Design a protein around this ligand. Structure first.
Ligand SMILES: Nc1ncnc2c1ncn2[C@@H]1O[C@H](COP(=O)(O)OP(=O)(O)OP(=O)(O)O)[C@@H](O)[C@H]1O
Ligand SMILES: Nc1ncnc2c1ncn2[C@@H]1O[C@H](COP(=O)(O)OP(=O)(O)OP(=O)(O)O)[C@@H](O)[C@H]1O
Ligand SMILES: Nc1ncnc2c1ncn2[C@@H]1O[C@H](COP(=O)(O)OP(=O)(O)OP(=O)(O)O)[C@@H](O)[C@H]1O
Ligand SMILES: Nc1ncnc2c1ncn2[C@@H]1O[C@H](COP(=O)(O)OP(=O)(O)OP(=O)(O)O)[C@@H](O)[C@H]1O
Ligand SMILES: Nc1ncnc2c1ncn2[C@@H]1O[C@H](COP(=O)(O)OP(=O)(O)O)[C@@H](O)[C@H]1O
Ligand SMILES: Nc1ncnc2c1ncn2[C@@H]1O[C@H](COP(=O)(O)OP(=O)(O)O)[C@@H](O)[C@H]1O
Ligand SMILES: [Mg+2]
Ligand SMILES: [Mg+2]
Ligand SMILES: [Mg+2]
Ligand SMILES: [Mg+2]
Ligand SMILES: [Mg+2]
Lengths: 260, 86, 277, 349, 148, 278, 220
C-alpha cells in the first residue's frame, strides 16, 4: 500500500540539463518513450544519461536510479561458494605458486608495499601446461584464498548462437567486474575463444575472433581496465592470439611443466 | 549394420513383370479403362520401372485421354503414357 | 498515400553539386548510364519506334574507389527527374518485415512520382547471394531481397522508374538480382588506364597551386594500378609534403614522392578484379 | 487573458510527454501524421504548440498522451551506446610519453590535427585534407597509446568506437550504431572517431553458398559509406587501428576512406631504451642502469614488453625490498618477460 | 470443475477479470495429429500394395506379431524385434508398406524427417531427437518411420 | 455478427486495368511448360467435370520452379491476361508483417477470397520467401514465418475437391523449399522452367524480334546457333541492346552490326574454360 | 523471469511481455531458490514477487533420466568378470559401502571408459549398472551431444551435468562418445571447431573449476 511498483526504463537524454527545470527522455523497455521529470526525493546528480532510470507508472516520474543491466548468464559466474582447495594441496610447482600468488593476491592484500615503490603490479597471468598439472587446481586455490570477487568463465561459455552475443557478454562481464572494487576473473579453457585470427576464405571463426577481440580491447584498450586481474588457463598455449599473449594483457605467463 | 540392431532387413527390388502388372492393375482401378486393355502388355513395355513410375504412367494415360477430349482411357493412352514416362 | 520519413529523406538527400566535368576516364560508362537514365525519360518514342522497351536497371560495378558513387552523385545532380538516394545497408531494420515494407514504400513512391530513379549504393549489403543454410537474419534479409526483385521485375511492370545499383563485390550478388531482366546493363567502372589517370590527376591537381613544370605523364607512369581515389590522395600527399616542408605551393618532386608513397600504401590491398557471373 | 491562456496551455503541457515522430507533414492549413513510440500512427489535424514550418519528416517531438497533440521538438536520438562511447574525461598522455614513435606521431598529428586548427594552410594551397588514418601495427607498438595521446592533446570531440561494439544481432543494428556515431560526431564541434581493433568489423567479404558473415559485412558497408560515400562528411576525422591489415577488406583500405596508412614498427634499440626510460621515470631508479644494454638484450621486444620488463624489474626488487634496480633487477625482468620455457640446456658448450 | 479433469495440455476458459478456470473447452488438436497432418504421409493398405507379398509377410511378422501376439516370442524365448530396415530404389513401396502395416496393426505411424516446421509440435525446446519418445509412448503402440 | 466473406487485405486484381499485357503469343517457345500450366490451372477450371469423369484428381499448386529468367513470372502474367477466372497475385514477402498474426490472417484472407470468387487462380511469386525449410524458433521472425507457412498448408489442405481454386507458386531456388509444401497431396504439382535449348532460342528470338523492325541482313540464325547457356531474359536483353545501339546511331532499323555488338556486350560469360582439361 | 536481485524486499522482474518492473519481494517468498533466470510468481496488479516456480522439470531432464530399471543384470552377463568387478568398484561399491573408501582414505574413481570393438557388452554393463544402482541414471550419446546452432553443444553439456548434480547421486552414461568426433554432420553450423568447443565443455564439466557433487561418469 506504500511502495508502488516501478517500471525500469533508461534515461536517453537530459533536455535542458542546466539548472532550469530539466526534462529527461526515458525509454521504458519495449513499452514506450517519454519525456519526464524527477521525483522531489531524487537529487538531479544521482541520475546520468545512461543509468537505468527506474520510473513509476502514472506520470512516469517517481525515480529510483538503477544499476546497469547484467545478463543472468554472466551474473551467474561469481564464485559464491569458495573451492575447498588450498595452496597446500598443490605440490611440485613452488615457483609457479609464488608468481601466481604475487600477481593475484599480494596487490589485493598489501597494496602499500607496491604504492611505496610506485610499481604497477602485473595484472594478467596465463597458467599453461599439459592436461593435468595444477592449472585448474591453482585457480581453485586462488579462488579459495582470495578475499575479492572471483568470477570464473569457461571458454565454451562465451560461444553463443547470435552474432555479437559473445562480445556482448564479455563487455557485461568486464563492466560488472569494474562495478566491483577488486575482481579476479579466471578464463578457464581459454583455448575455446582465444585463437589466432586467420583470414580463411569462408569467414570461419569470425564470431569467436570478434568476442576474443572484445576481450582484448577490454583487457587493454582506449580505457583504464580497472582493478581487474585476469587468469588464463590453457593446455594449448600455441593457438592463442599474439595480441592475447601480449604482456599488456597476459603479463605473467606461468608454465605448469610436468613435475620433476 | 552391427548385427544387433536392425532386427530385420527387407528388400524391395524393382518390380518384376508380374509385380508391375499388379501395380498397374491397382493404380488403374481408379480410372475409366475402356473394356479390354492389355495391362500385361503395358507392364512388359515398361521394364525396369518402379511403382511410382507405374502410377505416373497411369496418371499420364488419364491425361492423354483428357488431351484427346474423351471419357474413357484406352490402350493408346496407356501406350503414349508409357512412352512419355520412359 | 503515406510517404515514409525514410523515403522522404531518401528523395531529399543532397548529392552535392557534382558535375560531369569532375569525372575523368569514365566517358563510355557515363554515356551508357545516361543512355539508360536520361534519354528514355525525355524522348520515350524513339525506342517505341525501334520496337524495344528501354533498359531499366544499371549495375555500376568495379574495384573500390573507381568512381561509382561519384558517377551516381553526378547523375543525381545533373538530372531533373525524381531521384531516390539509399545505401542498401540503411534499409535493413530489425523489425519483422520492416525492410521489405520499406522497399515496397520506395517503389510506391517511385510509381507515384512517375519519372524516377532509385540509386542503391553498395547493393551487396542486401542483394547478396541467398543462403541454403543461413541464419534467421540471413533469411529476413533474403526476404527483403526477394521483395526488391519482385518490385523490379515481378508481376506489376515498372514504367518510367529506373534503377542504379553500385557495387565493388559483384561476384557475391544473387543471380536473380544480376539477371538481365532486373539489372539490364552491367557497366564496369574499371581502374583508370593511362589516359584516365592523366585526366583524373589533372582534375584533382587543377586547384593545387603548382609552381613548376609538372610531368603528369611521369606521375601517370608511376601511378600504374592506381584508382581515382588513389590519384586524389597522390595530390593530397604532394600537398602534405608541401606543408611539411613549409612551402605554399607544390612541385614535381613533391608529386613524385606522393605517388611513390601511395604506391607503397597500395601493397596492403588484396584481390580487386571481381566480376559478376 | 494572456495569463489565463498560458495557464491553460501549461496545464495541458504538463509532463510527461510521449515522444513521437513527425513521419509526414501534410497540407490540407498544415497537419501531421505523427507516429508515437507506442508504435501508433496518429493523424493530427492541428500540429500543436510547435511551429509547423519547423517540423520535417522523421524528427523527434513531444506529444500529449491523450490528445496526441505535438507539444515540443526534442533533440536527435543517439543510442545510449553511441553516447556512452564518447570521451568526456580526457586521457592524460603527452606525446612525450610516446617512445620510439616520432615519424608516426608527426604523420598522425598532421593528418588529424592540422586540418582542424590550421585549415588555412590547406585552403591556401588548394588541397583536400587527408581523410582517414589507419594505424597498422604488430601486437605491441603504440597504436592505442598514440590514440590516447591524440585524444588527450587534441581538445576536440573524441569518439572511441572500438571494433566489436558495432557487431550486434537484430539486423539493422550495428549499421544504426555506425550511422548514429558519425551523426553525433558531425553535430558536435570538430571531432575524431577512433576505431579500436578495426579487424573485428572490417574483415574481408567473401562469396558463400551456404552461410556467411553477412550482418557484420553489412555493418562494415555502412561504415564504408559513412567514411566515403554519397554524402561527404569532411568535418569528422577518423583514425582506425589494427594488428592485421591482411584481414581487412580492400574497400576499407582504399584512399579516401583511410588514406594515411601508417605502419608502426618494432622499436629499434634506441626506441626500446626510450620506452624503458619512459616506464622507469616514475620508479625509484638506481643511477647505474645501462638502458642501452637493456635495449640490446631486449631483442624484438615489441610494445608493452618493455613496460613489462620495467614492471617485472620492480617486482624483482620488491621481493627483497629496496630502493634500487642496479641493472640486475632489469636483467631478471628481461629474463622473465622473454617467457622462454624452462630447459636444462646447461650442457651446451 | 473437479481439478482432476484439468490434465495438462487441455484448453480451458478463464474469466476475464481475476482469471478463474470456469470451463474445460474441447481439447486442442493433438500435437501428433498436427505433425502427421503437416507431414501428410498418404494412407496405405495391403490392397493398395501389390507385387511385394513376401515383403508384406516379413514386415507383418516383425511388426504385427510383437504387438498383437507378444506371447509367441515369449514362448520361443527371444526378445521382440524392434528394428526394421527396407532396402530399395526410390518409389518401390517402402513408405507404402510401412504405412500399410502401421494402419492394419492400428499402430500410430509417426513420420520423422527432421523438418524444423514440426519441431514445435515435437517440443518447443527440441535440442534432442529423443523427445519424440514422449509422444510415441503416449500414442503407443507406435511405429516411428524414417526415410533416406 | 458474421461478416460477408469479402473482408481481406489482399484484393483481387481489377481486371479492367491491373491485368497484364503479356500473351502466349508474346511468350514464344516453352510450349511444354505452357501445356503443363494449361492442364494444371486452366483446363480443370472449365473441365473439372471431365477430370472427375475420366478419373483424374486435379491438382492445386504447380510451383513453376526453374532458373532465373526462364519465363515463370512471364507465364504467370500470360495466364492472368488470358484466363477468364478470378486471379489473386501476391508475393511471398508480403505475408510477413510487423503485427503478429498478420500474415496468417493474410493467407486466410487470400484463400477465402479465392474460394468465394471461384473459379480463381492464386499466384504467389517467390514462395521461397516464406516456404524456407530452416526455421529457428526463438527468433520471432522465423516463428511468424512458421505460422504463415503452417496456415498456408492448412488452407491448401482444407480445399476439398469441387472447389475451383488453383494455386500457382514461383521460386528461383526450389532446393530451399520445405518438402511439406511440395508434399504429395493437395499441396503442389511441379513444372520446370529450364534454360531454353537451341531451338527454343530460335523461337524466343523470333517472337522478341517480331515486334522490332530489323533490316533484312540480320539472319538471327547465326546468333541462335551458338554454344551459350542464355535465358529468355538474356535473349530479350540482346534484342533490347541491339535496339538501343540503333537508337544511339539514330536509326530506326536494327542492323547485323547492332546485333553483333549487342550480343558481345550482353553475353560476356566467356572466361576460364581451361583448354588442357579437354 | 527474475532478472536480478537488488536486495531483500526488492528485485527486477521481467514480465512475459518484456517489461522490466523493479518491484518489491514480500515476506511470503523464501528469499531463497531465487537466482537470475528463475521463474517467479507476480501479483497481477502490483507485480510484487510473491512466489517462485520451476517445480516442473524440462523435457531434456525427462528424456535424459532413466525412470526405469533395465531388465538386464550382472547375472545376465557372461565372461566380463574383471570388467564387472572394476565397473562395480567405480560406480556401485562407493555407493553401497562408502565405509571401505572412507577408511582407506581414497576417493573412488570419478569416471570409467568402456572401450571395445563393435559389440562386447559395454552398453550391457551400462544397463546392468542402471538396473542395480540406486543413483539416478542419465543416458546420453555423442551424436546426441552434437548440436545444430553455435553454443548449443556446450549448453547441452552444461544442462546435462547440472541435471546430474540436481539429481545426485547420479551416474551419467555417455554412450558412443566417439560420435562427437568421427561423425561429421551438416546440421552442425560451426563444424569441427564447434565440436572441439563442445569437447572442451565436456573437459571442464568432467574436471573443471566447479566442485562436482555425487556424479559418477561412465562413457562407452
Ligand atoms: N601439482 C599437483 N599437485 C597436486 N595435485 C595435482 C597436481 N596436478 C594435478 N593434480 C591433481 O589433478 C587434478 C588437478 O588437475 P587440473 O584440473 O588442475 O588440471 P589442468 O592442468 O587444468 O588440466 P586440463 O588441461 O585437463 O584442464 C586434481 O585431482 C589434483 O589432485
Ligand atoms: N573517375 C574518377 N574521376 C575523378 N575522381 C574519381 C574517379 N574515381 C574516383 N574518384 C575519386 O574517388 C573519391 C570518390 O570515389 P567513389 O565514392 O566514387 O568510389 P566508388 O567507385 O563508388 O568506390 P567504393 O567501392 O569504395 O564505394 C573522390 O575522391 C573522387 O574524386
Ligand atoms: N613506443 C612506445 N612508447 C611508450 N610506451 C609504449 C610504446 N609502445 C607500446 N607502449 C606501451 O604499450 C602499452 C599499450 O600498448 P598499446 O595499447 O598502444 O598497443 P597497440 O599498438 O594498440 O596494440 P594491441 O592492441 O594489438 O595490443 C602501454 O604500456 C604503452 O606504454
Ligand atoms: N520464353 C521466353 N520468351 C520470351 N521472352 C522471355 C521468355 N522467358 C523470359 N523472357 C523475357 O524475360 C523477362 C521475363 O522474366 P520472368 O519474370 O518471366 O522470369 P522468371 O523465370 O520468373 O525468373 P525470376 O524468378 O528469376 O525473375 C521478360 O523480359 C521476358 O521478355
Ligand atoms: N509395390 C507397390 N504397389 C503399389 N504401388 C506402389 C508400390 N510401390 C510404390 N508404389 C506407388 O509409388 C508411389 C510412391 O511410393 P513410395 O511409398 O514413395 O515408395 P518409397 O517409400 O520406396 O519411395 C506411391 O504412390 C505408391 O502408390
Ligand atoms: N556377455 C556379453 N558380451 C557381449 N555382448 C552381450 C553379452 N551379453 C549380452 N550381450 C548382447 O550384446 C548387446 C550389447 O552390445 P553393446 O555393449 O551395446 O555393444 P556396443 O556398445 O559396442 O555397440 C546386447 O544386445 C546384449 O544382448
Ligand atoms: Mg582444467
Ligand atoms: Mg561508393
Ligand atoms: Mg589497441
Ligand atoms: Mg519472376
Ligand atoms: Mg552400445
Amino acid at each position: 500500500q506504500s511502495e508502488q511498483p516501478l517500471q525500469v526504463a533508461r534515461c536517453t537524454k537530459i533536455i535542458n540539463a542546466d539548472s532550469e527545470d530539466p526534462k529527461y527522455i526515458i525509454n521504458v523497455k519495449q513499452f514506450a518513450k517519454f519525456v519526464v521529470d524527477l521525483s522531489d526525493q531524487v537529487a538531479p546528480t544521482d541520475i546520468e544519461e545512461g543509468m537505468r532510470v527506474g520510473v513509476d507508472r502514472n506520470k512516469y516520474q517517481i525515480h529510483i536510479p538503477l544499476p546497469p543491466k547484467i545478463d543472468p548468464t554472466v551474473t551467474m559466474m561469481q564464485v559464491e561458494e569458495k573451492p575447498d582447495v588450498t595452496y597446500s594441496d598443490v605440490g611440485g610447482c613452488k615457483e609457479q605458486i609464488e608468481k601466481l600468488r604475487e600477481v593475484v593476491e599480494t596487490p589485493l592484500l598489501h597494496p602499500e608495499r607496491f604504492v611505496n615503490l610506485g610499481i604497477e603490479p602485473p595484472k594478467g597471468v596465463l597458467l599453461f601446461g599439459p592436461p593435468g598439472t595444477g592449472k585448474t587446481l591453482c585457480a581453485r586455490a586462488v579462488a579459495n584464498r582470495t578475499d575479492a570477487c572471483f568470477i570464473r568463465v569457461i571458454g565454451s561459455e562465451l560461444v553463443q548462437k547470435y552474432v555479437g552475443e559473445g562480445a556482448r557478454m564479455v563487455r557485461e562481464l568486464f563492466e560488472m567486474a569494474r562495478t566491483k572494487k577488486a575482481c579476479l576473473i579466471f578464463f578457464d579453457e581459454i583455448d575455446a575463444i582465444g585463437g589466432a585470427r586467420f583470414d580463411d576464405g569462408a569467414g570461419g571463426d569470425n564470431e569467436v575472433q570478434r568476442t576474443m577481440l572484445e576481450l582484448i580491447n577490454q583487457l587493454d584498450g582506449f580505457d583504464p581496465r580497472g582493478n581487474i586481474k585476469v587468469l588464463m588457463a590453457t593446455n594449448r598455449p600455441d593457438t592463442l592470439d599474439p595480441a592475447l599473449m601480449r604482456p599488456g594483457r597476459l603479463d605473467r605467463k606461468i608454465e605448469f611443466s610436468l613435475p620433476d | 549394420l552391427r548385427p544387433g540392431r536392425i532386427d530385420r532387413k527387407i528388400e524391395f527390388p524393382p518390380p518384376n513383370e508380374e509385380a508391375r502388372l499388379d501395380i498397374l492393375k491397382i493404380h488403374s482401378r481408379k480410372m475409366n479403362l475402356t473394356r479390354g486393355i492389355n495391362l500385361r502388355k503395358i507392364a512388359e513395355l515398361m521394364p525396369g520401372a518402379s511403382g511410382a513410375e507405374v502410377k505416373g504412367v497411369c496418371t499420364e494415360a488419364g491425361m492423354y485421354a483428357l488431351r484427346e477430349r474423351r471419357v474413357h482411357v484406352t490402350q493408346e493412352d496407356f501406350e503414349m503414357a508409357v512412352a512419355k514416362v520412359m | 498515400r503515406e510517404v515514409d520519413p525514410l523515403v522522404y529523406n531518401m528523395s531529399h538527400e543532397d548529392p552535392g553539386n557534382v558535375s560531369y566535368s569532375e569525372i575523368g576516364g569514365l566517358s563510355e560508362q557515363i554515356r551508357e548510364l545516361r543512355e539508360v537514365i536520361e534519354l528514355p525519360l525525355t524522348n520515350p518514342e524513339l525506342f517505341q519506334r525501334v520496337g524495344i522497351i528501354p533498359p531499366k536497371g544499371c549495375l555500376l560495378y568495379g574495384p573500390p574507389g573507381t568512381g561509382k558513387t561519384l558517377l551516381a552523385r553526378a547523375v543525381a545532380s545533373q538530372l531533373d527527374c525524381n531521384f531516390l538516394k539509399v545505401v542498401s545497408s540503411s534499409i535493413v531494420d530489425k523489425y519483422i518485415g520492416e525492410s521489405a515494407r520499406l522497399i515496397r514504400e520506395m517503389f510506391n513512391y517511385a510509381r507515384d512520382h512517375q519519372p524516377c530513379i532509385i540509386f542503391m549504393d553498395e547493393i551487396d549489403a542486401i542483394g547478396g547471394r541467398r543462403f541454403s543454410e543461413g541464419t534467421s537474419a540471413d533469411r529476413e534479409i533474403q526476404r527483403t531481397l526477394m521483395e526488391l526483385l519482385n518490385q523490379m521485375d515481378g508481376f506489376d511492370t515498372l514504367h518510367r522508374v529506373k534503377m542504379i545499383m553500385a557495387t565493388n563485390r559483384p561476384d557475391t550478388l544473387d543471380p536473380a538480382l544480376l539477371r538481365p531482366g532486373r539489372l539490364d546493363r552491367k557497366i564496369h567502372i574499371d581502374l583508370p588506364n593511362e589516359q584516365a589517370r592523366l585526366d583524373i590527376l589533372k582534375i584533382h591537381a587543377g586547384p593545387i597551386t603548382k609552381h613548376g613544370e609538372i610531368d603528369y605523364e611521369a606521375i601517370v607512369k608511376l601511378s600504374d594500378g592506381f584508382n581515382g581515389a588513389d590519384l586524389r590522395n597522390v595530390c593530397t600527399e604532394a600537398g602534405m609534403f608541401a606543408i611539411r616542408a613549409d612551402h605554399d605551393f607544390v612541385v614535381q618532386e613533391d608529386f613524385m614522392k606522393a605517388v611513390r608513397k601511395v604506391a607503397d600504401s597500395k601493397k596492403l590491398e588484396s584481390k580487386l578484379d571481381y566480376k559478376p557471373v | 487573458k494572456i495569463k489565463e491562456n498560458s495557464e491553460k496551455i501549461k496545464v495541458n503541457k504538463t509532463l510527461p510527454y510521449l515522444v513521437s515522430n513527425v513521419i509526414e507533414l501534410l497540407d490540407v492549413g498544415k497537419c501531421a501524421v505523427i507516429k508515437t513510440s507506442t508504435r501508433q500512427t496518429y493523424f493530427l489535424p492541428v500540429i500543436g504548440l510547435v511551429d509547423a514550418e519547423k517540423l520535417k519528416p522523421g524528427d523527434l517531438v513531444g506529444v500529449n498522451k491523450d490528445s496526441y497533440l505535438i507539444l515540443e521538438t526534442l533533440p536527435t536520438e543517439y543510442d545510449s551506446r553511441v553516447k556512452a562511447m564518447e570521451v568526456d574525461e580526457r586521457p592524460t598522455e603527452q606525446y612525450s610519453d610516446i617512445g620510439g614513435l616520432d615519424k608516426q606521431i608527426q604523420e598522425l598529428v598532421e593528418a588529424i590535427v592540422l586540418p582542424m586548427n590550421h585549415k588555412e594552410k590547406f585552403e591556401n594551397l588548394g588541397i583536400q585534407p587527408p581523410k582517414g588514418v589507419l594505424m597498422y601495427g604488430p601486437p605491441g607498438t603504440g597504436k592505442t597509446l598514440l590514440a590516447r595521446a591524440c585524444a588527450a592533446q587534441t581538445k576536440a570531440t573524441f569518439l572511441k568506437l572500438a571494433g566489436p561494439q558495432l557487431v550486434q544481432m537484430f539486423i539493422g543494428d550495428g549499421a544504426k550504431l555506425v550511422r548514429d556515431a558519425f551523426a553525433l560526431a558531425k553535430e558536435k564541434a570538430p571531432s575524431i572517431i577512433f576505431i579500436d581493433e578495426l579487424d573485428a568489423i572490417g574483415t574481408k567479404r567473401f562469396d558463400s553458398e551456404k552461410a556467411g558473415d553477412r550482418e557484420v559485412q553489412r555493418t562494415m558497408l555502412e561504415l564504408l559509406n559513412q567514411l566515403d560515400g554519397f554524402q561527404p562528411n569532411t568535418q569528422v576525422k577518423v583514425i582506425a587501428a589494427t594488428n592485421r591489415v591482411d584481414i581487412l577488406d580492400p574497400a576499407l583500405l582504399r584512399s579516401g576512406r583511410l588514406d594515411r596508412k601508417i605502419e608502426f614498427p618494432m622499436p629499434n634499440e634506441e626506441a626500446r631504451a626510450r620506452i624503458m626510460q619512459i616506464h622507469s621515470r616514475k620508479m625509484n631508479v638506481s643511477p647505474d642502469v645501462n638502458y642501452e644494454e637493456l635495449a640490446r638484450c631486449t631483442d624484438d621486444f615489441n610494445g608493452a614488453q618493455c613496460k613489462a620488463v620495467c614492471v617485472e624489474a620492480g617486482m624483482i626488487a620488491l621481493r627483497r625490498g629496496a630502493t634500487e634496480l642496479t641493472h640486475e633487477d632489469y636483467m631478471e625482468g628481461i629474463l622473465e618477460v622473454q617467457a622462454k620455457k624452462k630447459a636444462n640446456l646447461q650442457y651446451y658448450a | 470443475i473437479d481439478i482432476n479433469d484439468v490434465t495438462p495440455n487441455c484448453r480451458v476458459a478463464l474469466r476475464n477479470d481475476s482469471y478463474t478456470l470456469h470451463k474445460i473447452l474441447p481439447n486442442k488438436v493433438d500435437p501428433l495429429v498436427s505433425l502427421m497432418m503437416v507431414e501428410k504421409v498418404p494412407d496405405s493398405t495391403y490392397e493398395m500394395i501389390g507385387g511385394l507379398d513376401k515383403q508384406i509377410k516379413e514386415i507383418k511378422e516383425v511388426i504385427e506379431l510383437p504387438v498383437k501376439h507378444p506371447e509367441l516370442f515369449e514362448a520361443l524365448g527371444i526378445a521382440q524385434p524392434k528394428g526394421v530396415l527396407l532396402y530399395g530404389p526410390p518409389g518401390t513401396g517402402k513408405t507404402l508398406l510401412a504405412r500399410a502395416v502401421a494402419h492394419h496393426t492400428d499402430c500410430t505411424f509417426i513420420r520423422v524427417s527432421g523438418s524444423e516446421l514440426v519441431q514445435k509440435f515435437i517440443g518447443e525446446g527440441a535440442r534432442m531427437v529423443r523427445e519424440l519418445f514422449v509422444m510415441a509412448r503416449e500414442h503407443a503402440p507406435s511405429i516411428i518411420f524414417m526415410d533416406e | 455478427d458474421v461478416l460477408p466473406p469479402e473482408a481481406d487485405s489482399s484484393i483481387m486484381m481489377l481486371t479492367s486495368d491491373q491485368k497484364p499485357d503479356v500473351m502466349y503469343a508474346d511468350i514464344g517457345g516453352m510450349d511444354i511448360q505452357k501445356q503443363e500450366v494449361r492442364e494444371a490451372v486452366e483446363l480443370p477450371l472449365t473441365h473439372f467435370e471431365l477430370y472427375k469423369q475420366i478419373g483424374i484428381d486435379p491438382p492445386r499448386g504447380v510451383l513453376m520452379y526453374g532458373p532465373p529468367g526462364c519465363g515463370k513470372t512471364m507465364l504467370a502474367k500470360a495466364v492472368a491476361h488470358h484466363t477468364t477466372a478470378a486471379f489473386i497475385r501476391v508475393v511471398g514477402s508480403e505475408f510477413v508483417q510487423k503485427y503478429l498474426g498478420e500474415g496468417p490472417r493474410m493467407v486466410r484472407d487470400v484463400f477465402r477470397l479465392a474460394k468465394e470468387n471461384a473459379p480463381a487462380i492464386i499466384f504467389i511469386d517467390e514462395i521461397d520467401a516464406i516456404a524456407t525449410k530452416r526455421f529457428d524458433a526463438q527468433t520471432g521472425a522465423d516463428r511468424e514465418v512458421q505460422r504463415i507457412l503452417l496456415e498456408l498448408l492448412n488452407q491448401m489442405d482444407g480445399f476439398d475437391q469441387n472447389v475451383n481454386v488453383k494455386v500457382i507458386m514461383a521460386t528461383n531456388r526450389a532446393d530451399t523449399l520445405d518438402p511439406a509444401l511440395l508434399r504429395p497431396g493437395r499441396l503442389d504439382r511441379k513444372i520446370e522452367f529450364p534454360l531454353p535449348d537451341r531451338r527454343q532460342k530460335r523461337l524466343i528470338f523470333s517472337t522478341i524480334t517480331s515486334k522490332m523492325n530489323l533490316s533484312e541482313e540480320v539472319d538471327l540464325e547465326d546468333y541462335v546457333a551458338r554454344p551459350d547457356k542464355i535465358s529468355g531474359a538474356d535473349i530479350n536483353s540482346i534484342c533490347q541492346e541491339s535496339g538501343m545501339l540503333a537508337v544511339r546511331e539514330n536509326r530506326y532499323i536494327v542492323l547485323a552490326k547492332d546485333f553483333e555488338k549487342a550480343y558481345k556486350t550482353v553475353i560476356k560469360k566467356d572466361e576460364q574454360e581451361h583448354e588442357f582439361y579437354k | 523471469t527474475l532478472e536480478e536481485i537488488i536486495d531483500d524486499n526488492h528485485a527486477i522482474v521481467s514480465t512475459s511481455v518484456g517489461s522490466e518492473h523493479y518491484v518489491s519481494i514480500l515476506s511470503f517468498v523464501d528469499k531463497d531458490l531465487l537466482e537470475p533466470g528463475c521463474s517467479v510468481l507476480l501479483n497481477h496488479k502490483v507485480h510484487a514477487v510473491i512466489g517462485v516456480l520451476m517445480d516442473d522439470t524440462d523435457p531434456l531432464v525427462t528424456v535424459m533420466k532413466v525412470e526405469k530399471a533395465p531388465q538386464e543384470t550382472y547375472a545376465d552377463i557372461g565372461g566380463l568378470d574383471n570388467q564387472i568387478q572394476e565397473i562395480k568398484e567405480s560406480v556401485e561399491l562407493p555407493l553401497t559401502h562408502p565405509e571401505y573408501y572412507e577408511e582407506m582414505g581414497i576417493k573412488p574413481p570419478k569416471g570409467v571408459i568402456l572401450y571395445g570393438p563393435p559389440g562386447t557388452g559395454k552398453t550391457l554393463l551400462a544397463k546392468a549398472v542402471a538396473n542395480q544402482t540406486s543413483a539416478t541414471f542419465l543416458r546420453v550419446v555423442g551424436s546426441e551431444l552434437i548440436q545444430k546452432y553455435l553454443g548449443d553443444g556446450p549448453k547441452l553439456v552444461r544442462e546435462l551435468f547440472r541435471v546430474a548434480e540436481e539429481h545426485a547421486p547420479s551416474i551419467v552414461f555417455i554412450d558412443e562418445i566417439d560420435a562427437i568426433g568421427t561423425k561429421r554432420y551438416d546440421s552442425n553450423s560451426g563444424g569441427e571447431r564447434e565440436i572441439q568447443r563442445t569437447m572442451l565443455e565436456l573437459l571442464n564439466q568432467l574436471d573443471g573449476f566447479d566442485s562436482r557433487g555425487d556424479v559418477k561418469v561412465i562413457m562407452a
